[PDB]
Amino acid sequence: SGPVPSRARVYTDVNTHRPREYWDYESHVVEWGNQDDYQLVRKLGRGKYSEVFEAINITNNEKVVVKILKPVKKKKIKREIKILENLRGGPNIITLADIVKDPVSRTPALVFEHVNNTDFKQLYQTLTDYDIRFYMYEILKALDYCHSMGIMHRDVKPHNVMIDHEHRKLRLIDWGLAEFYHPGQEYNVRVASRYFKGPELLVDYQMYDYSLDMWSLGCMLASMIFRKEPFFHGHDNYDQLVRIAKVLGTEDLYDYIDKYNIELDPRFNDILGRHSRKRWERFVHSENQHLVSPEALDFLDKLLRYDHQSRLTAREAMEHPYFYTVVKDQARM
């Protein structure tokens, strides 16, 4: 017997009830615009491979952001375009303004609404207690929306959250790894960055779902409240699970392996060892105690579970006490 199948606790069949066109992204026909409608101003520091650019729309003089798509399967391009189009106008989702090709090189590029080039990583180790809850709540709106729309992001990390702190404005960006959830579909586990990879990815359990994004959210939260970057600091993908095991303990790990009948890569057998589940108080100290509360810990604990089905959904997260004052203040303002 292979692995035991899994289904999402929420938004399970939403793509099935949609027209085929909603999710059959390979059949989507793109009307490619002309990139000469935009003049690039400067390269935005988004890493090495990345080719994001501040630019100007000549036609109306508005500032935009242009992402030159580095050569990759046309499949993957259509996927990112379709997801962005499907999620357009959703809470805290980056708006795709146009789809273009450079007339000479024919290289594909996506044109986005302007944001300040200040990602969450630059700000998220200097935030107040309140601001962490506020921005966590804002990320949760984007995730509940995209999940409700049948989409998992699969690359949630501080680098992919653009914050305008002056206007308290947040955009979840980089949907190039996002994918449509279909019950029973087995997915590629080579997604997300090391430190935010869910255990399902690490042990090679393929029938995963929206809950993946909630694990990554937990890693961000842990990092912010404990002022520890990253929280799970693995040398590689094998060691990454060891770092998780050293905090969450090995007992729940092996119970999770057994529950889903996961064949554990034999390489893991020597390295995981035996570890107790650590109390969060272990990571608290004078530098971070102002960010840490019972509510933060209870919330965090319910995100970081091996068993993907036992993690809070985005809507469940939004109803947690940790956000009560954020919710209260949002109602009045």
Ligand SMILES: Brc1cc2nn[nH]c2cc1Br
């Ligand atoms: Br800045 C920025 C970077 C991105 N990477 N992928 N999509 C993006 C959208 C914006 Br706006």
